[PDB]
C-alpha cells in the first residue's frame, strides 16, 4: 500500500508567521501523463471530520483563504499557511487519492506559539 508521511507531527509559530508542513508519498502521485497530482490537503478542527482545502497539490477549494497554498509534485509536497491566524489552529492532513479509498498521512497539529 501507499505510505503517506508528514513532517513534523506538530508545530507552532507566532501569530502572523508562516507555517510549513511536509508530506511524502511512497508512490509518485502524478496522474497518468498529466501535470496534476492526486494529492490533497485537509483541515480538521476538534471533534470534526477533515474538510478539503486543496486538490491537485495546489488548487484551492472554493471558499478556502488565500493564505493556504500547496506545492510539490511527484512524491514530496508542502502545505504552507503564509500568515497563521487563530482560526487556523487545527490538524492538517495530506491525502493521496490514487487508490480506492484514498488514505491520509498521519496529520500535523498546528498551533499558535505563546
x/- map, 10-49, Ca ion, by CB under 5 A: ----x-----------------x--x--------------
When asked if residue 45 is in the footprint of a copy of itself (CB under 8 A), the reply is no
Nearest-angstrom CA–CA distance, 75 and 62: 25
∠ CA 22-109-7, nearest 5°, is 25
Judged by CB under 8 A, the chain residues 57 through 96 that form the site for a copy of itself are 61, 91, 93, 95
C-alpha dihedral over 46, 50, 55, 59, to 10 degrees? -30
Contact 104, 56 (CB under 8 A): no
| 44 vs 75 by CB, closer to a copy of itself | 44
The one among 60, 67, 73, 104 contacting a copy of itself by CB under 8 A = 104
Show Cβ contacts of residue 16 under 8 Å, excluding neighbours closer than 6 positions.
83, 84, 85
To a copy of itself, the closest distance from the beta carbon of 34 in angstroms equals 9
| 19 vs 105 by CB, closer to a copy of itself | 105
Amino acid at each position: 500500500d501507499i505510505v503517506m508521511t508528514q513532517s513534523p507531527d506538530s508545530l507552532a509559530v507566532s501569530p502572523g508567521e508562516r507555517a510549513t508542513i511536509n508530506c511524502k508519498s511512497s508512490q509518485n502521485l502524478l496522474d497518468s501523463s498529466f501535470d496534476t497530482n492526486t494529492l490533497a490537503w485537509y483541515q480538521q478542527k476538534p471533534g470534526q471530520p477533515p474538510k478539503l482545502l486543496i486538490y491537485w497539490a495546489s488548487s484551492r477549494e472554493s471558499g478556502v483563504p488565500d493564505r493556504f497554498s500547496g506545492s510539490g509534485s511527484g512524491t514530496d509536497f508542502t502545505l504552507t499557511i503564509s500568515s497563521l491566524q487563530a482560526e487556523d489552529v487545527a490538524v492538517y492532513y495530506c491525502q493521496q487519492y490514487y487508490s480506492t479509498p484514498p488514505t491520509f498521512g498521519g496529520g500535523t497539529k498546528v498551533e499558535i506559539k505563546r
